[PDB]
Amino acid sequence: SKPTLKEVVIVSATRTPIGSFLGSLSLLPATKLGSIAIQGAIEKAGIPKEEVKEAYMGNVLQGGEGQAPTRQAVLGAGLPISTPCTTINKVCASGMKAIMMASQSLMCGHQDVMVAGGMESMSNVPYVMNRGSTPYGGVKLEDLIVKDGLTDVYNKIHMGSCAENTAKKLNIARNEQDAYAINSYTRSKAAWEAGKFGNEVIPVTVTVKGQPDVVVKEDEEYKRVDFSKVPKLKTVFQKENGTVTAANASTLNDGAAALVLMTADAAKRLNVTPLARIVAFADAAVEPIDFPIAPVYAASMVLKDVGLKKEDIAMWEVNEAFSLVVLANIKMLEIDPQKVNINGGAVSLGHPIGMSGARIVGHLTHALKQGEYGLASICNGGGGASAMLIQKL
Amino acid sequence: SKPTLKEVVIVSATRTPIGSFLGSLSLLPATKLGSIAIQGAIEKAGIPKEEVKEAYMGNVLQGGEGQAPTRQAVLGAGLPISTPCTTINKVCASGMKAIMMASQSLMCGHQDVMVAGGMESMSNVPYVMNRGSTPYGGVKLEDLIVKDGLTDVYNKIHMGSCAENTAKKLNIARNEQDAYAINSYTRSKAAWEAGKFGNEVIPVTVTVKGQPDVVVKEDEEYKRVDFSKVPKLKTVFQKENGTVTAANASTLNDGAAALVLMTADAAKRLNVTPLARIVAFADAAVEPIDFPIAPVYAASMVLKDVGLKKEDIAMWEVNEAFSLVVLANIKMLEIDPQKVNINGGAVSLGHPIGMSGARIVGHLTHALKQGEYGLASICNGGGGASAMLIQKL
Amino acid sequence: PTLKEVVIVSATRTPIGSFLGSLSLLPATKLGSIAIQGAIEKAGIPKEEVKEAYMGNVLQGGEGQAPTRQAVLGAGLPISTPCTTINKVCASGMKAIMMASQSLMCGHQDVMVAGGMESMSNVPYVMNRGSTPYGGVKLEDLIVKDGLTDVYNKIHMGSCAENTAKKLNIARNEQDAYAINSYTRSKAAWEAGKFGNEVIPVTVTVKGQPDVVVKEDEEYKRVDFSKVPKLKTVFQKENGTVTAANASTLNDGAAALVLMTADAAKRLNVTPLARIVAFADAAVEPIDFPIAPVYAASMVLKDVGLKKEDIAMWEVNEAFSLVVLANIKMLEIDPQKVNINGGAVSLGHPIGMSGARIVGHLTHALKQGEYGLASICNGGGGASAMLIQKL
Amino acid sequence: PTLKEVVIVSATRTPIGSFLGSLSLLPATKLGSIAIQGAIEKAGIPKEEVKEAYMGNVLQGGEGQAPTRQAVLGAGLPISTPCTTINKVCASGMKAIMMASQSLMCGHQDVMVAGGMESMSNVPYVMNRGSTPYGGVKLEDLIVKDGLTDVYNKIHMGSCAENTAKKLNIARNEQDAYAINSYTRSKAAWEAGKFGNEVIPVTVTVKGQPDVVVKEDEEYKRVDFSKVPKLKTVFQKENGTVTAANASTLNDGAAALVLMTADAAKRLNVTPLARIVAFADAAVEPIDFPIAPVYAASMVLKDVGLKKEDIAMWEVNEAFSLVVLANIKMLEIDPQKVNINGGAVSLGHPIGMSGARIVGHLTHALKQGEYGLASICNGGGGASAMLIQKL
Ligand SMILES: CC(C)(COP(=O)(O)OP(=O)(O)OC[C@H]1O[C@@H](n2cnc3c(N)ncnc32)[C@H](O)[C@@H]1OP(=O)(O)O)[C@@H](O)C(=O)NCCC(=O)NCCS
Ligand SMILES: CC(C)(COP(=O)(O)OP(=O)(O)OC[C@H]1O[C@@H](n2cnc3c(N)ncnc32)[C@H](O)[C@@H]1OP(=O)(O)O)[C@@H](O)C(=O)NCCC(=O)NCCS
Ligand SMILES: CC(C)(COP(=O)(O)OP(=O)(O)OC[C@H]1O[C@@H](n2cnc3c(N)ncnc32)[C@H](O)[C@@H]1OP(=O)(O)O)[C@@H](O)C(=O)NCCC(=O)NCCS
């Protein structure tokens, strides 16, 4: 027999703008961007801070951040000292997995109101030196972005080289990948200029003693592009017959996102209007080198579970880890390209890894029309993916 | 009314021995200790590896371990590439929180069989250097054990100094703390001598090319003691009227633990006999400085939830972060000290921070007699604690 | 065998670059090659005539094997040229000239190159060999550890200067006035074109960049006189005297001289600039290094029977303004004859280079028949001094 | 004035410690103090008579300001003693003695101390000044970067030796025979008490542990003759000849000599051990450093008018067994007169120390009236050589 569970709703979804690597938000640690997003979400939901019972935040690169990153973000947002906190790491899937795990606690009736999201400051990720005796001939200082973030343990190659493998297998060429990337930048600029993130993004003031304030109000990455340069660029992850470039891959970035989740009962009790219902979610895993196709199986599991067909989905958010990944998913699922990553994605907006899975779910929440279904999927290092289905209320 | 949930059972619980800092297990990465505990747990459960659907592992100090620590542990144990993995960080409570969150997935019917536990190799935790430019005059690279594991963010003091604060408030003196510590070493020795860890601990072979193999078959820490020296030690965190010493505090250590969890239905399908039922669990939080008393509130929450009295508990496992922590809990709960940490604990056995929360649940699993209730609780940095109630089958 | 007479035939230097400034892309050894090549060109002799080379260089860490050999081969000199790198802290550049002169005096060589080189911009940090200690690892800055810290007293060179300021009663306003005078004199000499024969320009070449020609000293323009009396006393909190403005700075540069016996100069028909008359080293209590040049200068004057009045120009290296004032006070010499075209407080102080630079400056600035005396202090309580006569 | 006669009055050294071994707790400067103090005691002169000091020291990074000054003051010599640190790579310790001899020959000092020191155990790693590059960086080992890599060829000293092994047809088996010979001679000489006047013991004090008295060289006992032919060729995978057993090792130690003019020895009632006759430096292509000592030795013989036959004993530094074999072959000398009591392959090679050690050894081992010739190669393609006669 199947358990009888509580219904879970999204009441608010807020994010910081995304900063470029060593760019506009580089002075702020990940936990502080977390505080900003969490306070933003609470404000937008219209509930007292004291109503939030527990918090989960995704965060992939936690080294040097200090004790209990999620607790820092939560206490920094002015939430009660009585609030338990857990920091989640499923690599790039962390921001989505946090929402999923929080949903499961709500479904069990173990809490009635929670905050879940993700945060990352890639600008502030440190280098490491090993503990022990210094070996004769040299001591390595490794970059934790490369070592913990972007290198497949098993193949000993960059995520970008794993992507090249799928480009080979599925015959997805340089020109197709470049066209997708240009498309992403185009959609991001359009959305931003049309005022489409007006309720999703909250601005950030950067203060430096002796300097005038800087107000960061929009995503930084999408303006850093030159369409004429795009087809000229070198293939950085493979010298012989490559396809992936700086322009058609996601970038390194800083940002945080937070959602307020509650049971249908609690939303009634607090007289708040729910934005969306969380219907179903799943995780899938494949051979580590094949992570780009893992979101295909995760999305399929979700559709099969709920009894829906791909054509029933109004809007897809397939995380733009690489242009290659989105094209692979479009090809295998046979879905309408006009319904995928409609207002841009990670290739042009950037990819603070622990945050992105939460951002894309928050974007569907705002963009879907009443009654429509949205499906968000995200690959992660090691061969995994997470996927989530929501319906707009 | 209340949700109707799947019943959750523990089928096996296994661990490596706990190694001392830079000691017998120091050559093995946390992820390798993870693979060993997971393999052991599946062997002891007597089920196909393919039946494990998903895995969660606690792990506090993830810097330099490589991409997706839990995935590394699971694949290194020979589990299917189809197995999704998430790495969990709630400081010292991590190993317990992993079991709790896995239990929640099982209750929702989202998976039927999971592995949960915790892993830490404090010997292999690195130092960090900031990204950017080196200041004129040099820099000190920070030790991540100290910066991420052991320093309160808000007070800017060691966990040990937070403990001194509780010692003051509740009048828990040096002599009482030293007596508790001696008692822990005594109880640990007694338990090993009596063969109380026979089914719980699996040995590990350390192989070094060009030297004989070393078989580690018991915990290393409890033999590193001198009872005569205990009352002579100086107080390491507070010179001015201190109480906490190297002897009466937990140590730095390496180890991993894993539990096979499934629904009661899955156990019947697979023809396995469960060891215990997971009944209830809870998280609590107080002011960061007051973490030593947080386990009191988490334990009370659990008892109230199920409607039991403290007298109903046959065995207590209150993690021995410091001798002070246990005495503080005994004092406030007003429970029988003969029922607390009966076979030793972290003061004498050691404290690989991400694993201890799982170890103590695993020990109750084996030590309890049929029908008895066991309660485990564990404090964590930032002011939190987790607690879990199980019943022997 | 009777001792041979030694002459200076040429003396050349790079401009001095500021810390992390205009010359920071070039290693010390490359600056040394440029200086050496320029000196040989000015001397008007084939490179093959140079028999052996000594270069001063204080902070050799990370420069690679045999720094002087790198400078020499980099300048296109023969593979047969033996090379030695000299370390007497700030006195290194002068000590190299002294030791080369001694080899020439013995008839062991007939033509040598000697000088000094330093790239403080490129001096690395160090980590100790061994087990990493619990709680953290220290990365020390070699400029501070090897260059600027007194071993015995465990204080900065600047704190040693404060000590002398106390004992000899040399005040903050006096040191500030001297520093302003140094900056003023440096600017005046550059504007008068007094370095036209001494300094050679350096071309800095970067990939995908337009070439940059560095033709003058960088440091002397980095000053605000109105701010001088307001600066904090960085080496001492209470009643301090030494500041960033009145102390020498950290810098990059190289200098080189072609030296010959009188017989070799004649054989090659070169016109020598100056004769080397005498030189000496003195040493005192480590903290008292500011006064060691007084004793070294005194030794050289006494050696040749000259009085302080017989000296036309003094170069007392400006380690700190305090040092020059202390020397003037103890020696009782005319300040208008001391560091007349500026010095290390305003031009900068690449430590292994400065003792060569000041001897090379005398060689160009002295008029025929005049005597010049150069002295320079060094960490540990030492000083070197040299007397030359213009030909 | 004519050139003064120079004599060696004493020569003393520490034992040589293995890499990270028995002397690894002591800095190079402390080892220097021990050797300098011993040399002065043995000379029987007041310490105030020593006027100036030069010490060889190749790897100066992290040792603190003015390494020679630290050694001198640590030995209890007066603060009035000027100090200079000398770097000619492996030739440093000899070149220091040569340069001191020139100062004495000129009449500039009458009594000096010269020698060399090195603590390879305490040589640090370096990190470049600047911003850390994306993707990380390896902190270089200064032993490798400054000590043992040829700048121009970008290969290890050991690979340079391979080049000479190929050119002169000196095979693996011949190199292994020479190395076993060195270990055998070292053990025999220690057992015969031949170092009793040369080596002074070192007490290593550690709080909470008993003292350790180091009384003999550590390295020569670390050998297994049956394993020598089984080792891998660590510098060259294909067709190699150089191994860990037949190469010098990395080590800690210091040596110091007291030098005087003949007049000074008379004045002080000192009976000197030997006279310094002549010395020279030679240089060739950097890759060809193994053969430079042939040319330096030939220069000294030619200068003085002696034949190779007139030399009673040769000390050709054992940088590699290959180097010694190449020198014997080109010079055509009796192998029974070469490195008679062992050398660097088995006693070890603290690089700034060895050039001084070998001159000190000849001073003790030669019989009255006999000539000894010492020679030593250095990175960059150099060598130094010196002739002495026993009195
Ligand atoms: C790809 C990556 C290594 C960056 O490469 P990079 O070479 O250091 O990037 P650069 O900025 O130096 O780009 C090099 C060139 O590309 C150009 N370029 C980059 N993006 C461009 C764009 N959008 N439009 C036009 N030109 C662009 C730059 O102008 C530069 O030009 P240049 O060669 O004349 O100097 C890094 O962003 C990365 O690793 N991305 C993948 C992140 C990832 O794996 N995420 C997780 C997914 S699972
Ligand atoms: C306390 C801590 C810093 C270790 O301190 P330390 O001073 O480096 O420990 P040491 O091994 O140097 O021991 C110090 C002295 O105590 C002695 N000692 C240690 N354990 C002993 C024992 N069990 N019995 C008798 N003597 C003991 C040692 O012999 C030593 O004596 P000495 O100085 O005369 O030689 C470290 O274990 C720690 O931080 N523990 C807390 C872990 C923690 O906070 N975990 C999180 C929980 S919230
Ligand atoms: C003194 C020393 C530590 C530099 O100190 P510093 O404080 O880091 O120097 P800075 O460049 O940051 O200068 C600090 C201030 O002084 C000012 N300043 C520096 N030189 C100045 C000048 N010539 N005129 C006016 N102002 C000046 C700067 O503008 C700055 O002002 P701010 O704090 O309002 O911005 C360094 O040059 C040194 O060690 N010198 C001695 C070298 C030495 O000892 N050599 C060996 C001799 S024995």
Ligand SMILES: CC(C)(COP(=O)(O)OP(=O)(O)OC[C@H]1O[C@@H](n2cnc3c(N)ncnc32)[C@H](O)[C@@H]1OP(=O)(O)O)[C@@H](O)C(=O)NCCC(=O)NCCS
């Ligand atoms: C050669 C050098 C790199 C060390 O090599 P290494 O491989 O780290 O040396 P090791 O101590 O690890 O010895 C390797 C093996 O040789 C063996 N070995 C070494 N010396 C031996 C000897 N004298 N007899 C027998 N066996 C010996 C060791 O037992 C070891 O055996 P194993 O592989 O079974 O464990 C280093 O000593 C060096 O660079 N020397 C040259 C110094 C130099 O260039 N000086 C300047 C001259 S210009």
Ligand SMILES: [Cl-]
């Ligand atoms: Cl918490």
Ligand SMILES: [Cl-]
């Ligand atoms: Cl996964």
Ligand SMILES: [Cl-]
């Ligand atoms: Cl000196």
Ligand SMILES: [Cl-]
């Ligand atoms: Cl040379």
Ligand SMILES: [K+]
């Ligand atoms: K891009």
Ligand SMILES: [K+]
């Ligand atoms: K203990």
Ligand SMILES: [K+]
């Ligand atoms: K200045």
Ligand SMILES: [K+]
């Ligand atoms: K050897």
